Amino acid sequence: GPSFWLGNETLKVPLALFALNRQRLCERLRKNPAVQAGSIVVLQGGEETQRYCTDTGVLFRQESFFHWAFGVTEPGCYGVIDVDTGKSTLFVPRLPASHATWMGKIHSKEHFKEKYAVDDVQYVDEIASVLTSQKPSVLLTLRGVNTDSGSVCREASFDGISKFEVNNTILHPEIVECRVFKTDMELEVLRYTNKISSEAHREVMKAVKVGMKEYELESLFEHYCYSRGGMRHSSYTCICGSAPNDRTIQNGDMCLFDMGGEYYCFASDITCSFPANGKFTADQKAVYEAVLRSSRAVMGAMKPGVWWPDMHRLADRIHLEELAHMGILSGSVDAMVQAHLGAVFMPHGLGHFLGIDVHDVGGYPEGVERIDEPGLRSLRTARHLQPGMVLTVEPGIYFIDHLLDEALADPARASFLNREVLQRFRGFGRVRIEEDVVVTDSGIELLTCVPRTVEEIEACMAGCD
Amino acid sequence: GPSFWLGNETLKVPLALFALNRQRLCERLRKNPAVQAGSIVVLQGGEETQRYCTDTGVLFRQESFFHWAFGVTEPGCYGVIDVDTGKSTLFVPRLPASHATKIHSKEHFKEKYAVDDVQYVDEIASVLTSQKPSVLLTLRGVNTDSGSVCREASFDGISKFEVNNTILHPEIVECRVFKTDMELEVLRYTNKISSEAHREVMKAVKVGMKEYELESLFEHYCYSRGGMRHSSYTCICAVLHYGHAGAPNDRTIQNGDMCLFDMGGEYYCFASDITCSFPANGKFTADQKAVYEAVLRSSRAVMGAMKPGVWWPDMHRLADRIHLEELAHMGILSGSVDAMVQAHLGAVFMPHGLGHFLGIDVHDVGGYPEGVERIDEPGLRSLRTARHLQPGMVLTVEPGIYFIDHLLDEALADPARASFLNREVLQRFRGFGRVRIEEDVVVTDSGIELLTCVPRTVEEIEACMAGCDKAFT
Ligand code: PRO
Ligand code: PRO
Ligand SMILES: [Mn+2]
Ligand SMILES: [Mn+2]
Ligand SMILES: [Mn+2]
Ligand SMILES: [Mn+2]
Ligand SMILES: [O-]
Ligand SMILES: [O-]
Incomplete structure (x- = not known):
């Protein structure tokens, strides 16, 4: 399958690594007596940030739980995982024409599917429609306390998420344990x-x-x-x-x-x-x-x-x-x-x-x-x-x-x-x-x-x- | 006076640079007909940030308007300037002992930055109250490259003051130009x-x-x-292969x-x-x-x-x-x-x-x-x-x-x-x-x-x- 690589003597990292992580997480959730059948894990990736009120970009680095699950380097994405089947769907930003001018080619969803070896790719503005069509019992979102910073992990949110049943207590300890x-x-x-x-x-x-x-x-x-x-x-x-x-x-x-x-x-x-x-x-x-x-x-x-x-x-x-x-x-x-x-x-x-x-x-x-x-x-x-x-x-x-x-x-x-x-x-x-x-x-x-x-x-x- | 310097062949930057900027800003504000006597400029410096919910630090870089006025590299500060006299006060975080595991005095910061006074951040409401300003001039406006709105200074108790957030931004921008x-x-x-x-x-x-x-x-x-x-x-x-210029x-x-x-x-x-x-x-x-x-x-x-x-x-x-x-x-x-x-x-x-x-x-x-x-x-x-x-x-x-x-x-x-x-x-x-x-x-x-x-x-x-x-031509 595909790999991450920066050429020369750098390490080739198979995208299979992240597939294995997703499977491991699902295997763990399936054993959790509180997890309802038809649950879907929903993770939100990081977005690009700027210095204060300026247009000076801050070097983007992916959010760690999201990276662990997907290995995705692009800002503005979401990723979900059907707990029962393990099926993975990546949601990527729908980019405009000016992106072709100012910062390079605009890739297809097919491109991202191939690159990340996930089961499906959709656009971010369709996430509510796609999740609705799949008729989940509940969305498992990420919320918990980091015991080194004292900070609370930021739960995924998107337009229309209010229409879903959301659980934000189950996932964190389980995905943390996998990462250990x-x-x-x-x-x-x-x-x-x-x-x-x-x-x-x-x-x-x-x-x-x-x-x-x-x-x-x-x-x-x-x-x-x-x-x-x-x-x-x-x-x-x-x-x-x-x-x-x-x-x-x-x-x-x-x-x-x-x-x-x-x-x-x-x-x-x-x-x-x-x-x-x-x-x-x-x-x-x-x-x-x-x-x-x-x-x-x-x-x-x-x-x-x-x-x-x-x-x-x-x-x-x-x-x-x-x-x-x-x-x-x-x-x-x-x-x-x-x-x-x-x-x-x-x-x-x-x-x-x-x-x-x-x-x-x-x-x-x-x-x-x-x-x-x-x-x-x-x-x-x-x-x-x-x-x-x-x-x-x-x-x-x-x-x-x-x-x-x-x-x-x-x-x-x-x-x-x-x-x-x-x-x-x-x-x-x-x-x-x-x-x-x-x-x-x-x-x-x-x-x-x-x-x-x-x-x-x-x-x-x-x-x- | 003191200077910022990283040794070797690097440039010595006098802290007078920032004192001159404060002076220029006050001179501009004094000629501004809408500025009340006894007005005080209040700027809030940047704070340290971490990667998402982790304790991994993001390299701190001072907010630009606050830098322009004060040259302060430390996170968590505030800075105030009395328009009528030009008097500058730096507010610095009161650090616990566990930080020592050296903690600088207010005097150390006063000497380092060549400001007129230094106080702790948690005292800002008390100190400004005691100075009896007419109005606090804060920073709010639109950056025309990002479209973002500049963050106005705030502190516990600022509601007890009269605050004007319209005068300052165009004036301090024009000074920076x-x-x-x-x-x-x-x-x-x-x-x-x-x-x-x-x-x-x-x-x-x-x-x-x-x-x-x-x-x-x-x-x-x-x-x-x-x-x-x-x-x-x-x-x-590349933006192409990985999604961001970074x-x-x-x-x-x-x-x-x-x-x-x-x-x-x-x-x-x-x-x-x-x-x-x-x-x-x-x-x-x-x-x-x-x-x-x-x-x-x-x-x-x-x-x-x-x-x-x-x-x-x-x-x-x-x-x-x-x-x-x-x-x-x-x-x-x-x-x-x-x-x-x-x-x-x-x-x-x-x-x-x-x-x-x-x-x-x-x-x-x-x-x-x-x-x-x-x-x-x-x-x-x-x-x-x-x-x-x-x-x-x-x-x-x-x-x-x-x-x-x-x-x-x-x-x-x-x-x-x-x-x-x-x-x-x-x-x-x-x-x-x-x-x-x-x-x-x-x-x-x-x-x-x-x-x-x-x-x-x-x-x-x-x-x-x-x-x-390089000398060859
Ligand atoms: O952003 C700008 O104004 C210029 C255009 C080329 C890259 N930097
Ligand atoms: O933060 C820690 O736990 C270790 C010990 C001091 C430096 N890093
Ligand atoms: Mn350039
Ligand atoms: Mn340029
Ligand atoms: Mn270490
Ligand atoms: Mn260590
Ligand atoms: O440029
Ligand atoms: O360490």
Whole structure:
């Protein structure tokens, strides 16, 4: 069948991927006791937007649920799926003559059917008539709460939808659950996005020179991903530690570069930390290797059945052990964990689902509660791991004055801290190591492939090989 | 005073630039007979947005009127200007501690932006109440390129004030139409970097490359060497294969192609908009040279004719006449050029407007103020302004010749036009492609200043693509 492709060495993505997703969604809905026979899923795609009141276009990126279901790149579309049969219909805008003049040929419905391998194509202004003729029991529309943004998903609407029975509660948890588990075809794309972003991270490490501006490396990263990967979008706003990051990379700095390209709306999210000048100091090596250790410990321990908060607390324990070894901390690490001391140095969650969104959906379905403790409350899922899930593993150690100050004021934590040693690490900066992995039947598969050991990084930055 | 700067070789932009804009706006409003004493301008800055319902951030770019007045890069702000004194107050978000996981003081923002006062956003009603203004002047009006209505500032409690939303928009638009010398320094810089990027594209292009490889290179040059985080507009190198101009242009560049790259970077929310046309393989064919030099001729004729008092639609018509003359000299057209012009035949080859205001927006504001009417003729109806030129305006000059099948076929089906076309010669230019030459210029007291600096003659272009140092001529 047909595929998405940007030529050269970019990945060919079969439109069969989205067909499989639709089938999987229907299979799930059919098992839902509340789903009436003759139901039709109705999804509305994204539309082109402009900057404020200007005619300056904003780069269009498809809505994620709609992309997952259809892979459609064009703005202004809808898509529906007959639950009982799986039949898919794409609705495309009916375009005017001036479109031929100003922005190219006007394609038939037949063109779109062939391109997207859907069962039928119609125009958007006919959607009420087409759905009416098919006489559905109910329309299943998308409405739910994203547990990372707090935003409510926007339900599809069209002229005449008021004439239909609409249910907006059933679909969201079911399509979210499908997205949580990646198909082999989806994993191929996420392997590819990780490949290109990994390569771009290597180029950044080779290119960094003291005196450069961070945004120069952000630029290089995006250029590598676009020109070699066909990755037009960054998955997220690029974080370039050491809205352009115009900090000058200084001798002695620890760099932290958190960046990931997106291919055909499939994300990647990778973080590398390394010394700006290519040589770890003793202190930098100590902190860096602590995070390397927790990174590897978590990846190693991950398998179906593991509770993700246990992995977070595993990383905490290891960080505290290493910080104690360094002399920053003293006393019982058991006692330290009881006092939540780990969250002083790692305030964010250990890692998150990744897929079509960087912070992918489904981390907190009904029945899965957020843990109200420091560190853990910032976890973007408290689920147990299962095969097919894609996660970031991103422990880090940070020296954040206001977290440190709070701990030093609190007698339950202040005891553990050696102020004379900690003083040396004020303004140390921060280390984060972020890998993308997939859960397998027995463990994980690592998607990311960048230099990680002190030896590998120093050799890479020195221009070796 | 303070300046915006991204280090290295990037331009230092004094925050005085925005203080001068605030001053000019107040001076205009003071002379406006309908403005009450004690009036206060209230502008609302943009807020951060996310992709749909996700927490994926969209890169924040300040709203243009708010930028023009304040130069503030942070989301979530408001800005107020007391008309009678010119006193400026920035309102900034009160950030929680979790943001530290550094938070700047109000004093830090006051120093950074060289405003008279800074307050937190949640205090705006209290602060304005205490200042006892007569009326709040807010922004509402119609953008004549998008058709959209400018968003009027609002805050909890604004209902307790008298609000006028009609005075400000035409006045602040008119201020934006006329660029200050400080604004011109930024536009010179954006044009310099974008011109250099266009040269790098011409130097790098190889048969067999995808167009988006060149778009990527352009963006990388502008960002890494110019600090231009944003393209000014969606960069044109596909709408066809993926539905939006923003999608990657994934056509493979072929031998014999004519390339058209329309791209321009933005620095600190000041735009550029440049188009270069050139042969993919670095050598103009006789036909390519002919079409190209026709557009070069119209480009230069217009630039040579522009000065204060010139009616912009007359420049569009002048380009039309030159295109038709040259197309006739090529044997694509035959007959009376005067007759062709009467038949609006120029619009067959150049369906768009000759050029447009440029500033903080690529298609900048103020092209159609009250009393200035859109001309309902082919080509001219697409002009983004029908104003007379005055010193301080910044315009693009972007004539082009296109061979667009359905426009040509329509002309061939029209008895009023069909005779002018020689199919025997025209047939050879089907699939020729497109030439557009787009310069950015400033209207001076007596003519123009050219901001753009790219190779333009056939020899200059061929030299650039052959890797000659820019100094070579
Ligand atoms: O948002 C998150 O969960 C991770 C940790 C900080 C950067 N990204
Ligand atoms: O929109 C405009 O005015 C011009 C026409 C060609 C592309 N940009
Ligand atoms: Mn990250
Ligand atoms: Mn992440
Ligand atoms: Mn242009
Ligand atoms: Mn233009
Ligand atoms: O991350
Ligand atoms: O343009």
